[PDB]
């Protein structure tokens, strides 16, 4: 687990670590739906 705030300085870096390491992620102070988080909330998975 990692828990992060919305208006936080290290948001996208910790988001990258949470997508890579397989964490379970909780976000605190959301003011809506972020622009960044649209393909992750959808399914956008190109295969390698």
């Amino acid at each position: 687990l990692e828990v992060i705030n919305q208006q936080d300085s290290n948001f996208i870096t910790a988001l990258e670590l949470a997508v890579r390491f397989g964490k379970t992620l909780i976000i605190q102070e959301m003011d809506g739906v972020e622009p960044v988080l649209y393909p992750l909330l959808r399914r956008d998975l190109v295969a390698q």
Partner: protein, 240 residues
């Protein structure tokens, strides 16, 4: 993060931990610089003297009589399979000693160990009798060809060094074994075999000399003749 990537041209590619890379080569030269040779360890499959001797010896045994060849094949294969099965039967001796280390006098594992050790002693005595029943039975039917193969292994290393004065004097080995086939297939010599061995070395030197002087330049045949004579009989010119 947890993984690693490695550069291949333009792409970025995940380096899987199960990566093992081997690569073959058909010519000893080409090609290494002195930069890509301090990281790559180099292995040269080569035909040498003692191997080529046994190769031509096996060819002569197979071309003398097929029965001795089939016998020396089947006996060696059965001896190898018996050695592997003997190691397998003696591989349960650790289990019979310390499979559990308790109630070894009680359970019937010590009873089955007696049967296994009986099988081991039977196979050991049988392999002793078999290794006695193949040694002189193969030596007297295999040693009737090696004074042919000895000088036939001399002649190839004679004609190997012919390239180092004139280029395109580079000779293969597949055609050489084709010649060694042609020595049998055209002979049809019915005599004593000990009278046949000098006949076959005699009718092989002629075919070697003619096959090489098909290729040579006209100012080089005396070179080839004298180096060939120095190669075959090094005793007739003594020392210094």
């Amino acid at each position: 993060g947890p993984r690693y990537v490695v550069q291949i041209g333009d792409k970025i590619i995940d380096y899987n931990e199960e990566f093992r890379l081997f690569l073959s080569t058909r010519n000893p030269n080409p090609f290494i610089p002195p930069d890509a040779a301090s990281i790559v360890t180099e292995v040269n499959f080569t035909t040498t003297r003692s191997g080529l001797r046994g190769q031509l010896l096996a060819l002569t045994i197979q071309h003398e009589k097929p029965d001795l060849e089939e016998q020396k094949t089947k006996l060696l294969q059965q001896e190898e399979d018996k050695k592997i099965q003997l190691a397998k039967l003696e591989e349960s001796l650790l289990e019979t000693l310390a499979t559990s280390q308790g109630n070894i006098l009680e359970n019937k594992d010590l009873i089955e160990s007696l049967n296994q050790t009986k099988a081991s002693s039977a196979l050991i005595q049988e392999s002793l009798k078999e290794s006695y029943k193949l040694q002189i039975s193969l030596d007297q039917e295999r040693d009737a060809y090696l004074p042919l193969a000895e000088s036939a292994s001399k002649m190839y290393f004679i004609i190997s060094d012919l390239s180092k004065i004139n280029n395109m004097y580079r000779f293969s080995l597949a055609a050489f074994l084709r010649l060694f086939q042609r020595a049998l297939q055209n002979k049809q010599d019915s005599e004593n075999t000990e009278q046949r061995i000098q006949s076959l070395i005699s009718s092989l030197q002629h075919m070697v000399y003619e096959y090489i002087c098909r290729c040579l330049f006209k100012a080089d045949q005396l070179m080839f003749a004298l180096h060939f004579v120095r190669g075959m009989h090094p005793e007739l010119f003594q020392e210094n």
